[PDB]
Amino acid sequence: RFXXX
Amino acid sequence: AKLVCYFTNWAQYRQGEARFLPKDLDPSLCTHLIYAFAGMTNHQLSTTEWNDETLYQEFNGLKKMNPKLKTLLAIGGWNFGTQKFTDMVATANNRQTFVNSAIRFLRKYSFDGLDLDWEYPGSQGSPAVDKERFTTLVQDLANAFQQEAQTSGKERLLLSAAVPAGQTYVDAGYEVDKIAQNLDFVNLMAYDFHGSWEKVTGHNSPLYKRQEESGAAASLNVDAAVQQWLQKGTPASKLILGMPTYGRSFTLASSSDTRVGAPATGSGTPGPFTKEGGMLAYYEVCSWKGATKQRIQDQKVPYIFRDNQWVGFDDVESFKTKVSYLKQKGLGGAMVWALDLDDFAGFSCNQGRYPLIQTLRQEL
């Protein structure tokens, strides 16, 4: 988050 | 109280002491272990790593050591995206295909339930109608799991969902009062409140707001997120408070300015083992030599900085504070992302194995 995840 | 812990199936690929295998799992550490992640193929539940089936056996095999332990398989995650979920919930036939496949798959590999981790319905590529289609999916799974228990005599498969803390994502995809009645528990992702995607430093998981924050910013904390999910209809007993065993890092514009809210230029240096700029496992920040650790007084969490590197993370003390908090709020327990990011092998923090998660177990 929030594409790296 | 529940202690819900996520296992990730890519941690087996890290090097040295960071490598995590089911052998590193403690059968009595958590009450519920969730396997991240499963995906989908042709609207049917499927594995995502080449050796998952072998790992599933080892994972669910832990129940022979601790009969009270329950396991669930999580479908989705951030990298999985939204398209496959959107396509599956689009029609009654695709939802049926998925639901039937899930029961069969969960029973085949001896999982006790399913954790829905769509990130997220109604945003990130998923249209607005997916908010109500997600509600239908949750009803479909709940209905099916109840029916299978009635017809088979087996203990009913559990259904949970990992949900966002951000008001925008919550408003875009979740009919909270509706899905909460069908879910056995709600895994609130009470983290990622701040990160290198912002232009100033901020803590990954602060318990409360900073005095200086107001408006939308005042909702970027654990307490605000919990109050939101409870206010919108989640029974407190079903709300499980997520806890991060990792921190979020930043590169400071100036090593001379290290406060919370100081100018930042981007992600912090990738950790030696996790190799992902912007985040560090607890074992990657707990032993910094030459660093300066401080606690954000009103937010009740720590951060540490050295030179132009700054990282907000959670320690034993903040985890104790957060458990006191969840108890006072009457929540159902704690959830942790993730087993492999705590110092599971006790090789770095000088606090033994699983220092953070063991703290949750003892405090709960």
Swiss-Prot record, chain B:
Keywords attached to this entry: Carbohydrate metabolism, Chitin degradation, Chitin-binding, Disulfide bond, Glycoprotein, Glycosidase, Hydrolase, Lysosome, Polysaccharide degradation, Secreted, Signal
Cellular component terms (Gene Ontology): extracellular region; extracellular space; lysosome; specific granule lumen; tertiary granule lumen
Reaction equations catalysed: Random endo-hydrolysis of N-acetyl-beta-D-glucosaminide (1->4)-beta-linkages in chitin and chitodextrins
Taxonomic superkingdom: Eukaryota
Positions glycosylated per UniProt: N79
An example Gene Ontology molecular-function term: chitinase activity
Ranges for domain GH18: 1-364
Any one Gene Ontology BP term: response to bacterium
Active site positions, chain numbering: E119 (proton donor)
UniProt-annotated binding residues for chitin: E49, W50, G76, G77, W78, N79, Y120, M189, A190, Y191, D192, W337
Known tissue expression: Detected in spleen. Secreted by cultured macrophages.
Subcellular localization: Secreted; Lysosome
EC number: 3.2.1.14
Disulfide bonds: C5-C30, C286-C349
Top EC group: hydrolase
Note: Very high plasma levels of CHIT1 are found in patients with Gaucher disease type 1 (GD I). Can be used as diagnostic aid and to evaluate the success of treatment that brings levels back to normal.
Complex and partners: Monomer.
Family designation: Belongs to the glycosyl hydrolase 18 family. Chitinase class II subfamily.
Function: Degrades chitin, chitotriose and chitobiose. May participate in the defense against nematodes and other pathogens. Isoform 3 has no enzymatic activity.
Full protein name: Chitotriosidase-1
Species of the source: Homo sapiens (Human)
